[PDB]
Ligand SMILES: Nc1ncnc2c1ncn2[C@@H]1O[C@H](COP(=O)(O)OP(=O)(O)OP(=O)(O)O)[C@@H](O)[C@H]1O
């Protein structure tokens with residue numbers, strides 16, 4: 433069908 | 446500059462510097478406390494008359510973390526004379542070491558000793574390294590435990606690892622007893638030590654056991670003499686080979702277990718079909734209890750008989766196999782590629798002791 | 807967002823040659839993967855092996871990922887706290903093999919393949935961190 437929307441990426445260092 | 450290598454066993458600890466060809470320090474895994482502050486190693490054994498002696502490693506596994514910590518402290522400060530905060534440390538572990546133990550070693554290194562970096566490697570894997578291979582099966586037998594360990598490209602395969610509680614100390618004990626059944630007495634602690642030397646000096650593995658037994662009853666040709674420290678001379682006959690026969694026949698010790706040869710086959714058989722030939726082709730012996738003469742040949746024979754008739758079988762039993770673990774560790778920690786594999790202090794700080802689970806396997 | 811960005815995050819540091827995010831519920835499908843590599847071709851059958859009830863057969867048989875034959879080293883995929891499986895590829899003719907980690911979340915599998923000579927440890931840690939972020943997001 434289709435996949436869910438991606439959540440936000442983990443913040444970076 | 447130099448990484449350190451520490452191989453902690455049930456009986457003996459081996460410590461040194463990566464790069465070196467031998468451990469700089471080999472000493473008994475013992476902590477002694479006055480019977481009513483603490484000594485480790487050879488000093489504890491010397492003062493064993495006035496100390497309570499503890500063995501913090503049992504069957505390859507740490508059972509007393511305060512004692513272990515003292516061994517490590519002693520290792521760093523007295524035997525190697527280094528400060529642990531200046532060296533990355535490679536530590537060894539038993540196959541199938543409980544997760545909590547692995548975390549505890551990590552935490553102690555980083556929090557107690559301030560190591561800048563550390564790694565924990567399975568003992569049998571390091572032995573494979575020392576023999577120049579990446580894939581094979583290791584049969585490791587020390588003072589308190591035996592294991593068969595299938596390894597693929599450097600990675601042990603826990604599902605197929607087998608354990609046998611039957612090793613050097615049991616062998617020593619069994620020798621004590623059969624000699625006692627022969628007439629001479631052996632029961633005490635200093636007697637045990639004599640018998641262990643007899644074992645180390647005169648025992649061997651027979652190729653065909655039932656034939657050796659007849660041979661020893663037919664003539665006194667396989668009879669060897671041993672001088673006690675008491676000056677006196679005793680003669681040992683078939684005991685020479687009956688002692689080590691227990692590795693192949695654990696009934697001799699009242700065990701239902703399979704022997705080393707059969708447990709090697711059993712481990713192989715749990716492996717991926719595609720590697721079984723590479724295992725059969727690279728059976729590596731390691732540990733002190735593999736120093737018996739005749740052992741490699743006996744293993745060759747026993748496995749050939751369990752294998753497919755076309756299977757190529759090769760037993761690798763290096764002459765330096767008593768310290769195959771350390772040596773392998775020395776080799777590994779010296780590689781430029783091992784530098785990626787360290788747990789850094791920043792990583793420990795970031796993740797905690799459970800980092801060892803992601804990183805060491 | 808979307809999922810392709812997850813693949814670029816994973817490939818950013820240059821240790822990896824392949825990455826995939828795969829949904830394992832319902833009708834399994836790859837949500838993102840590096841094109842022209844292996845993971846982009848995993849099948850629902852391959853996925854169900856990974857997540858299924860039979861956790862021993864794959865030791866003697868191996869398993870596959872996008873057709874690539876791999877050997878199982880560690881299985882903790884269904885375990886709370888670890889949620890991972892480590893694998894090594896198989897090859898023929900002396901061609902290089904590579905380390906793989908699969909990590910499992912609420913809805914996804916995360917799959918990573920190391921470049922030559924990259925330790926299974928780096929790959930596991932990496933795939934685990936990403937899974938851990940996804941679990942924290944209810945994914
Ligand atoms: N030449 C020899 N022949 C037979 N046995 C030997 C010989 N040399 C040492 N051993 C035995 O090997 C054992 C110790 O070996 P090793 O150092 O590999 O064990 P460990 O690492 O202390 O213990 P483990 O691996 O079981 O935790 C002792 O039982 C010792 O008597």
Ligand SMILES: [Ca+2]
Pocket residue numbers: 453454455568587732770
């Ligand atoms: Ca050992």
